[PDB]
Design a protein around this ligand. Structure first.
Ligand code: FAD
Ligand code: FAD
Lengths: 401, 401
């Protein structure tokens, strides 16, 4: 069932959350974690937020207190594993035996093929090292180009503008946040960033670059001192692929975290898993999944009577003045707008319904509403639609009832 | 590894191929097959072909000779399985114990929601019973409407025209055979069927029906004596889903046929698996996959040193005068056309290349070319493109060299 010793590959949030839950649940056997970064395990969301602004890494470290008696092999890369011999080969020449193996290796930013042989600074933003390297080029009045209009690029955009950096952003699609965000939210977010001086370019792609200038597919040019590419990430599933596990930009797992290989599990950004709301498999790229899936898989390993992972997806994003929170699906057959959608003191809530059932919710500067909406979302509530729009209605009431 | 006893759910081609390989490979333990159809196991491709024309079911039975000492529970449905207790519950009230469970339950035709409460004959074509029921309504000069332009619908269309039946066909897309067929092939196939009197309607959908007439989304009508729906199939993965296996319109499996659940495997139409040419997961809906995956998974269960499933995909279709064969991918960056594409004695070959490498091939009334092209495809050959077009070139030569 849960066979000792436990080895976890990756030392990010999913891994930390998993090994802490193992200990809290009562497992007292060996746990060894292999982490390729030579860094005290740390959280990523600050990297495009407060960290990029203030630069104190000792404010972003994960709490490994609830994970006593774990050996963390930092700065070491797992190079392969042999699922028959039950061993992992490490880059330092050592080998770890395992009873249970857990792949928590995350994902890495996609490169932009058109900028491959570029001769100007081109970075991505995933690691503490990336953030330090980017932060060191945020010279006031310098020009930054961001490729991709996902939340991390937008968080960087807002951080950069706040630092006095001129920001341009190129987005292949007609809208920002094309992944898991209601169109109404995306349109509003574009209006916000535009108003803050971000030069937004929709429906354009990068074709290449020459001497410090980026080329676009409309035949035009954008000069920049630095490009940050943020067009999404790819699962770090190479070990799983080589060992014969079912993978496709992500290791396939069930609700117990099981891969297709006996005694090998996977969690976090590296997994492709069932979204309970859509009923489809997808790679979920959020902080809450990394933590919550790690916890669920550990809990069930120690107590096989515990249910499989069942949490519904949600995330947040801090983009200057906008505190954004998004849960569930981006769309259904109906959207209910609570409040006015306005650049003047932005504060609104969106609710997505499918045949009367809540399937998604968004809060912008409205954190008190988010928690009740997530509970209503969780039980598939079908509240009165007039009430939901009715600003008099208090949402915490409904959830309680 | 391979633990006795073996239980297989489903008694179609994948199942028959698997249990035959188990015996041929040397496994002598118990094998029990559960099949919900009360029929001697039979092959499906004849159902839209020679069978629909001649009606002799004793010409379409599968050969279970290479599978001695198998108990076939025909006319029995597996209702659930318990992967911890290692048992399967049957619809006749019995329970089967298993060491190794194999899900080979295939797929079923999708229903058309717009025709749900229709009051006219609406059938799909998957089973021997379906074919008999459809064949009994192919009255000469009757009017048949087919929904969907996939190969089975087109095979039925050609069979029906040959029987003197007036045939209309409604296709949501701009082209027939939208799944895994080169556009050049699809365009030609439309010209053939049109020339044979099939009334083709592209870019239309069915909105409903009233008193023997089908309604379309262009606001028009088609009267018919019978509708056959052929808009694709859905994996029969309900048992796997209920038991906690990773599924998404298909049970996820690696190259060994392993699901995410220890001691449970899956094969054939029910699986979602890696396509080696695209490197993506897909549900492969072909005769050759059912046979070849069944054989590979069995072989590796008996001999763990054997490689995992590795065959590249291919299928054929018989549509009146057209003997169509298709291997690999529908497209690449280049297509080479061997011969003329003409309704006058149709006979041509298509070759799809990606950066000089063969990734796909089509033969129409040109079976001698198909086998060499599949071998060239298998080794990722990069032959001379001028030679490939050069009709002088004999293809069997190249493959040999
Ligand atoms: C800049 C940024 C901002 C974000 N903001 C938010 C946010 O506001 N809200 C939100 O919901 N989410 C946010 N996220 C997303 C979030 O942080 C991720 O979902 C989360 O980090 C995933 O955790 P993980 O443990 O699964 O993967 P990871 O954090 O990527 O950890 C995996 C670790 O394993 C390492 N590894 C990989 N391969 C090997 C190997 N062979 N051997 C050893 N180690 C290996 C990796 O290098 C990595 O260190 C943000 C992410 C980034 C990068
Ligand atoms: C009309 C038609 C024409 C075709 N023509 C071609 C062709 O020319 N070329 C080609 O490449 N392919 C063709 N195919 C495709 C091909 O035949 C399939 O790919 C193949 O049948 C798949 O085999 P299978 O064993 O995986 O699934 P199946 O043949 O569907 O067998 C599965 C069996 O398991 C049964 N079952 C399901 N659930 C349970 C349960 N809970 N308990 C017990 N039994 C269960 C099913 O009813 C079914 O009998 C055709 C298919 C059809 C229907």
């Amino acid at each position: 069932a849960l066979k000792a010793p436990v080895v976890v590959l990756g030392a990010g949030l999913a891994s930390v959350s998993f090994v802490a839950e193992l200990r809290q649940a009562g497992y007292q056997g060996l746990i060894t974690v292999v982490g390729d970064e030579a860094e005290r395990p740390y959280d990523r969301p600050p990297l495009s937020k407060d960290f990029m602004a203030h630069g104190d890494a000792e404010k972003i470290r994960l709490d490994c207190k609830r994970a006593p008696e774990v050996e963390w092999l930092l700065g070491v890369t797992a190079q392969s594993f042999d699922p028959q011999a039950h061993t992992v080969a490490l880059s330092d020449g050592r080998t770890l035996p395992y009873g249970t193996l857990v792949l928590a290796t995350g994902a890495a930013p996609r490169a932009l093929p058109t900028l491959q042989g570029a001769t100007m600074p081109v970075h991505t933003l995933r690691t503490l090292e990336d953030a330090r390297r980017i932060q060191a080029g945020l010279r006031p009045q310098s020009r930054l180009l961001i490729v991709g209009g996902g939340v991390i690029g937008l968080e960087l955009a807002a951080t950069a503008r706040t630092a006095g950096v001129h920001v341009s952003l190129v987005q292949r699609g007609p809208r920002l946040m094309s992944r898991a965000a209601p169109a109404t939210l995306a349109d509003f977010v574009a209006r916000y960033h535009a108003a803050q001086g971000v030069d937004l370019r929709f429906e354009r792609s990068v074709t290449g670059s020459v001497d410090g200038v980026v080329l676009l597919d409309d035949g035009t040019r954008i000069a920049a001192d630095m490009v940050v590419v943020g067009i999404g990430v790819l699962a770090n599933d190479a070990l799983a692929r080589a060992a014969g596990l079912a993978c496709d930009d992500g290791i396939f797992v069930d609700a117990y975290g099981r891969t297709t290989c006996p005694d090998v599990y996977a969690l976090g950004d590296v997994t492709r898993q069932r979204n309970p709301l859509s009923g489809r498999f997808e790679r979920i790229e959020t902080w809450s999944n990394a933590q919550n899936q790690g916890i669920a898989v550990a809990r069930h390993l120690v107590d096989p009577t515990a249910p499989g992972y069942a949490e519904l997806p949600w995330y947040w994003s801090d983009q200057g003045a906008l505190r954004i929170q998004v849960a569930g699906l981006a769309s259904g057959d109906e959207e209910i707008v609570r409040g006015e959608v306005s650049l003047d003191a932005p504060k609104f809530t969106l609710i997505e319904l499918q045949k009367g059932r809540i399937v998604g919710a968004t809060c912008v500067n409205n954190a008190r509403d988010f928690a009740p909406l997530r509970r209503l979302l969780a039980v598939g509530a079908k509240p009165d639609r007039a009430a939901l729009a009715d600003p008099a209605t208090d949402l915490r009431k409904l959830a309680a009832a």
